[PDB]
Amino acid sequence: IPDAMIVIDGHGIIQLFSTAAERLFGWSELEAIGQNVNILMPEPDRSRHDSYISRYRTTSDPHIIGIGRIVTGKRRDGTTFPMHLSIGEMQSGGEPYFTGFVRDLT
Amino acid sequence: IPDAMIVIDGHGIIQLFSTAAERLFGWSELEAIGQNVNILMPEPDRSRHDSYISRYRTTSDPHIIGIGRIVTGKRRDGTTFPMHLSIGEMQSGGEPYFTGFVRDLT
Ligand code: HEM
Ligand code: HEM
Numbered sequence: 001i002p003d004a005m006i007v008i009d010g011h012g013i014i015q016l017f018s019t020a021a022e023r024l025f026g027w028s029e030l031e032a033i034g035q036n037v038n039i040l041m042p043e044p045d046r047s048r049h050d051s052y053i054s055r056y057r058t059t060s061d062p063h064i065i066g067i068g069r070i071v072t073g074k075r076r077d078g079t080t081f082p083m084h085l086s087i088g089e090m091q092s093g094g095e096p097y098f099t100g101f102v103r104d105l106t
Numbered sequence: 107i108p109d110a111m112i113v114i115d116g117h118g119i120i121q122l123f124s125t126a127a128e129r130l131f132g133w134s135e136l137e138a139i140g141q142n143v144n145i146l147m148p149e150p151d152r153s154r155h156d157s158y159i160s161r162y163r164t165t166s167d168p169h170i171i172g173i174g175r176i177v178t179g180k181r182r183d184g185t186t187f188p189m190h191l192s193i194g195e196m197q198s199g200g201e202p203y204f205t206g207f208v209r210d211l212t
C-alpha cells in the first residue's frame with residue numbers, strides 16, 4: 001500500500017488526490033480537488049501556507065521541497081496526526097505543479 | 107492538468123499509479139507497483155527506457171522533463187494509444203523520483 005499523494009497547482013489548489021490520500025485525510029478526491037491544500041493542516045500552518053508557496057515562487061529557495069519534514073496533518077473529521085512530507089516540483093503545459101507525498105507516522 | 111499520474115523511482119520502478127492511470131493502462135496500482143514503467147510502452151522504447159533514465163541521471167540534460175512529448179502508450183491488453191507525457195524530477199529521502207502525467211490523446 002503506497003503513501004498518500006497530492007498534486008497542487010502554483011496557488012496551492014489541489015488538482016489530484018490519491019486513493020491513499022482519501023483514506024488518510026478523509027476527503028474524497030472530488031471534494032479535495034478545487035480546495036486549497038491548506039485545509040489539510042492545523043493552524044498556524046493553515047493560515048501561513050499560501051505565503052510559503054508564494055515565497056518559494058519568488059525566491060526559489062526550498063525549505064521542504066527535496067528536503068522533507070515531519071509536520072502535523074489534519075483530517076476531514078478535524079483530528080490531527082504526525083506525518084512526513086516530501087515535495088517535488090514539475091512543469092506541465094508551461095505552469096508549475098507540486099506533488100506531495102505524505103507518510104502517516106501513526 | 108492531466109488526470110493520469112505515475113511515479114517511478116530512479117530505476118524506473120513504479121511507486122504510485124493514480125486511478126486514471128489504472129483505467130487508461132488497464133493495471134491496478136497494486137499490480138503496477140514494483141514493476142518497471144517500461145511495461146506501459148511498446149518497443150523500441152520499452153527495452154530502451156532504463157537507458158533513458160540512466161542517461162538523464164548522468165547528464166542532467168532533460169529530453170522530456172520540463173518540455174513534454176507525444177509518445178505511444180501500451181495497455182495491458184496489448185493495444186496502443188497516443189499520449190502526451192509530462193515529467194518532473196523530485197527527491198524523497200535523498201533518492202530521485204520522477205512524476206509523470208499522461209494525457210490520452212485518443
Ligand atoms: C498537509 C500537511 C502540510 C503541512 C503541515 C505543510 C507545511 C508546510 C510548511 C511549514 C512549509 C514552509 C517550510 C518553511 O518555510 O519552513 C511548507 C511549504 C510548502 N508546502 Fe506545505 N505542508 C503540507 C502539505 C503540503 C502538500 C501536500 C504540498 C504539495 C502537494 C505542499 C506544498 C508546499 C510547497 C510548494 C511549499 C513551498 C516550498 C518549500 O518551502 O520548500 N505542502 N509547507
Ligand atoms: C508509458 C509511456 C512512456 C513512453 C513511451 C516513454 C518514452 C520515453 C522517451 C522516448 C524518452 C526520451 C528518450 C531520449 O531522451 O532519447 C523518455 C525519457 C524519460 N522518461 Fe519515459 N516514457 C513513458 C512514460 C514515462 C513515465 C510515466 C515516466 C515517469 C513517471 C517516465 C520517465 C522518464 C524519465 C525520467 C526520462 C528521462 C528524462 C527526460 O527525458 O527528460 N516515462 N521516456
Ligand SMILES: [Cl-]
Pocket residue numbers: 066067068069085086087197198199200
Ligand atoms: Cl524528502
